[PDB]
């Protein structure tokens, strides 16, 4: 147990899928997993462990912003033994030919935040995922057809900016989608040495101002989820 | 209702109290307001409205972190008419005349963060709390025999932070006390024109490693509720 | 004596007011202050220390800007004893909403200048002044019949700028008033473990270009350096 | 032509190797290339165009450092049509298990440089190479029998840093390999559109002051010669 | 007349010696000018104007701190058409080579002040000295028979800075000495397109703590005003 | 001897004149120097040693941009005893006043770049250059009937560059040209103890885009070579 984890060592498992949502956690645990047991719930931050096709596979949410997630990735890798830390999550879109439903790898994570500048002396830190991961759920992907974009992801750490001319300077470098803690979660594995992956769901467009139709919207989440639990698979072998 | 809060116009009132853990807010609604009903669920972010002494008061969590609380801070103010936010917490103190059990009333807030420097044109921007609100917390403070200590609080962006050097500037300028999220609140009020205060309670000491007990944790938080309860009656004259 | 004072300990009270000009110091020794005499004037900044209503209290000038009052602040603070330092002084506004003769208190102060961060290691310190000197100051002005506005104010470290769009972040983000010194002072009392204040007299609206006249004042300056003596009374009870 | 390069569109073939020495690109040219003809030297720095295998191929050294390498890529990327480039050099390794001779891949890749914040409104950009291109090489080099390290390279701007400090905080972080252009590199091929990867060998150990022999540098680098050459093969596949 | 300057178009010669103590500009006024006379006195701040050698010069003191400095040469360049300003103050050296009573001119001038980033974009500006002004310093050195040291000067913000480490890293670069205003007067000039220069006697060593004696001080002082009065003949040619 | 220079001491002359192109170095050397003996030729980067009215000088090119000039540089003072460099190129003129075919001397060197920074702890470092030197080269130009410009040159790190604005900003405070390189130069001088000097002709400008004939091209080159030569001849007496 630690400050934010009400859970005993070997009470997850080696890889750990992190929605935002809490509930999304339970959702995932009793949609996708088997024999799942809640393992974690101390701030209402959901928890739970089970089997998927054999494989133990945890599930828990990871709050919203950089400093949420990465408090939470912190205590599981280090007094939890966690390996690889895969985020599904949703991603609003900039650039007009990425469509709604499309699923994104973020291969690297720009940012707003300052986490990165503390831990590397002001200099440009690459927030960058695994490439094992990354090329695992591509190749989990397209094996359930669908045609995923690995590129750059944008973590904002105010959901409402102020400044709105941000969003034409990410599309003329072409970042696929914008979400709020794909570069923390991408510092705290370099830092404490883990694996980490970030795949998101396009769920509404900056400029086509369109957003998913419920029905729709969760078809594509399990889409996403599948393409995770599947990588993860894909990666041990 | 928003994307983050299921509510609509009038089911909070102008006044909300914000502990970190939606736990919290549950237990203050069920033990100090009279007739709570749940007014937000989405995230497991639970949201209460009720009465005290026929003041009409709502309590509410934020979550971990300035992202996380500076969008719900944001919502309540312009989509629900919040006027005023009053953040309950604890805080570690670096100082060793501040002891355990100690409230901190947050006048300033220092902070590693970059939010207030993308608002603030990369300048200086003090992240202050309202005077009569913090004038109004030395008052209850008072009457309850509570000595508060008024000064600056430091609003981390890690709670697991790579530099521990930092603990002796914070101590070296005097911070009363190092949480996460007080200059977030105070840059969002600013931004939309409302007022806030964050209160806080010391349950750790960082030089003398000092914690507080779960039963005193329990008594100094009520104290801690006890007092931005009458604070918000004080500020109604 | 020091290289910027010419006097020894005990010839300075334990609290200092600080105007800008050292001919406004030699005013309110003679208009204000009982058997006061001269007991500093090395570079001009005219020095005094006399009595009001029997207490002890000195008035000296600081000069423009915060490395010139950051001199003269730490000095007093470390070679002169001064415990309490009461900066009074002009300021423009910004805000539509503020008019002039307006009496701003400054709670905290933003600033352009680096000053803060080189002590601060690049982060975000909050310059605040002393919650007890800041009641102090809006009691008297109550007693007088005037009602103080409290908040942010902002040092200015180039009076003649070439960014005219700073204004505008300034009024969206409620500073009260621009002016050049209090971020220093503030730097200076957390640095050195004293406390300070700084109340200003609003002389013109940067927005709307109008200045005071040379006879109203007259009378604010007055109305003003009345409080800041009854304000150091008040914190003497 | 453009003011850096004497050749006329159509010279240079859709992908072009690009090596830092001139001499370097003119090896390649006539140890691995059929045909291959010199395309521009406008400053010595020697470009050829051949062909491997049937398809074409331009190879162009690029020069040291961000500011010359910048200038190259952009050019051929506007003016020459060119799709992809790949950097072949050298770098050296400051973690313990990256040994000599090892191939490493630069996934992503951090900097000292000011150039990206130039371009990213002072936020943090993530460098990065064409995901495509990596899982390519890294194929091409499983293929030829040697294992590639896939990950983050560090982009210098000073060969001779005055800061010896930071290559711990490089080591903490685990980057693989400290170069000069990479991150400048993936920079313009972001601007303008276009894709790119860099591949380097450790030559150099920085802690354990070690270096390659001559031998051992001629032949290592013939490995990676050939790990670009395949890998564009297996992309057009 | 301007804000800080009562004085009348006219009323300045087109060159002005600006002594940090207003009462340097007294004595310098009284001691090397002929028929001089007050032309300015507001804040303290003596400014006189008189003849030496039939060229009509003027002499004003400019406060402490770039802040102040910046305020009185910016309406004295705009309002009152001085086309050249000098500097005349004292210096402490850093460098071990370097000896009390050393005459040094600042060609230019490094800085801890924000003030050059906010007129050049965050950029580095090579806060320098006009040429001509600079090489006829040197010459009338020369002839009064002494050797100047020309180079770099640091203008500093904080004169009680918390950081004694800096002071290794001026010596490390080779700096002259360090005052607080070369800078502010150096970026004003060129925001305004005057010309501008700055001129030292080594009061002190940071190093060795030695400070020079009155009696030496005085003479040194003389010496360097000659220089500065010397070198506004040879430009007039 | 060095990873970049295939020399031996003694082979450079104490004095080293860089143009920006290797190409250019030869001629220089087969144009003006006597006897010229090739002296290095490892990256292409053509290094000469020869005899000009019997002082002996070497020639050698240095790349484009900070990070390549940087390490030319720091070989040269630190490991084949050159005591001063002089850096002979073309720049763009911004001012409408600065005419074509003019001669620019860089007393100053604003940047683009971070690599100053690095070296002076994140503070504003003056890169200037030696005044001797550049005071023998206004000479030996007004010699030659040529009227020199003396002030500030910016130093690019981007030739490409996206933010178009900072051409209207380097107007304003009168910078004389943009290149790629003195204010590197100028920073490894002053690291190393070494004297440097850039001179520069305008060849075009960056507004008004007037281009200028090669063969006036070759003229102007040529005089700015006589001028930098004859400097050095002065700088002997």
Same mark, same amino acid.
């Given at each position: 147990?630690?400050?934010?984890?009400?859970?005993?060592?070997?009470?997850?498992?080696?890889?750990?899928?992190?929605?935002?949502?809490?509930?999304?956690?339970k959702?995932?645990?009793?949609?996708?997993?088997?024999?799942?047991?809640?393992?974690?719930?101390?701030?209402?931050?959901?928890g739970?462990?089970?089997?998927?096709?054999?494989?133990?596979?945890? $599930?828990? /949410?990871? #709050?919203?912003?950089?400093? @949420?997630?990465?408090?939470?990735?912190?205590?599981?890798i280090? &007094? !939890?033994?966690?390996?690889?830390?895969?985020r599904?999550?949703?991603?609003?879109?900039?650039?007009?030919?990425?469509?709604?439903?499309?699923? $994104?790898? /973020?291969? #690297?994570?720009?940012?707003? @935040?300052?986490?990165?500048?503390?831990?590397?002396?002001?200099? &440009? !830190?690459?927030?960058?995922?695994?490439?094992?991961?990354?090329?695992?759920?591509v190749?989990?992907?397209?094996?359930?057809?669908?045609d995923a974009?690995?590129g750059?992801?944008?973590?904002?750490?105010?959901?409402?900016?102020?400044?709105?001319?941000?969003?034409?300077?990410?599309?003329?470098?072409?970042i696929?989608?914008?979400?709020?803690?794909?570069?923390?979660?991408?510092?705290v594995?370099?830092?404490?040495?883990?694996?980490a992956l970030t795949?998101?769901?396009?769920?509404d467009?900056?400029?086509?101002?369109?957003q998913?139709?419920?029905?729709?919207?969760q078809?594509?989440?399990?889409?996403?989820?599948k393409?995770?639990?599947?990588?993860?698979?894909?990666?041990?072998?």
């Amino acid at each position: 147990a630690t400050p934010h984890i009400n859970a005993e060592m070997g009470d997850f498992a080696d890889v750990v899928l992190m929605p935002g949502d809490p509930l999304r956690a339970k959702y995932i645990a009793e949609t996708f997993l088997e024999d799942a047991r809640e393992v974690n719930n101390v701030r209402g931050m959901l928890g739970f462990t089970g089997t998927y096709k054999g494989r133990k596979i945890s $599930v828990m /949410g990871h #709050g919203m912003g950089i400093p @949420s997630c990465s408090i939470y990735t912190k205590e599981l890798i280090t &007094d !939890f033994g966690v390996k690889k830390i895969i985020r599904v999550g949703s991603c609003g879109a900039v650039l007009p030919h990425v469509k709604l439903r499309d699923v $994104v790898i /973020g291969m #690297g994570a720009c940012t707003d @935040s300052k986490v990165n500048r503390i831990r590397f002396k002001d200099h &440009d !830190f690459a927030a960058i995922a695994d490439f094992d991961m990354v090329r695992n759920a591509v190749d989990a992907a397209k094996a359930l057809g669908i045609d995923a974009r690995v590129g750059n992801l944008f973590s904002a750490d105010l959901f409402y900016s102020p400044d709105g001319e941000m969003f034409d300077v990410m599309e003329k470098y072409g970042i696929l989608g914008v979400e709020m803690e794909a570069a923390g979660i991408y510092g705290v594995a370099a830092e404490f040495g883990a694996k980490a992956l970030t795949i998101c769901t396009v769920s509404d467009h900056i400029r086509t101002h369109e957003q998913t139709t419920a029905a729709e919207r969760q078809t594509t989440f399990n889409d996403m989820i599948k393409i995770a639990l599947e990588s993860v698979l894909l990666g041990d072998k």
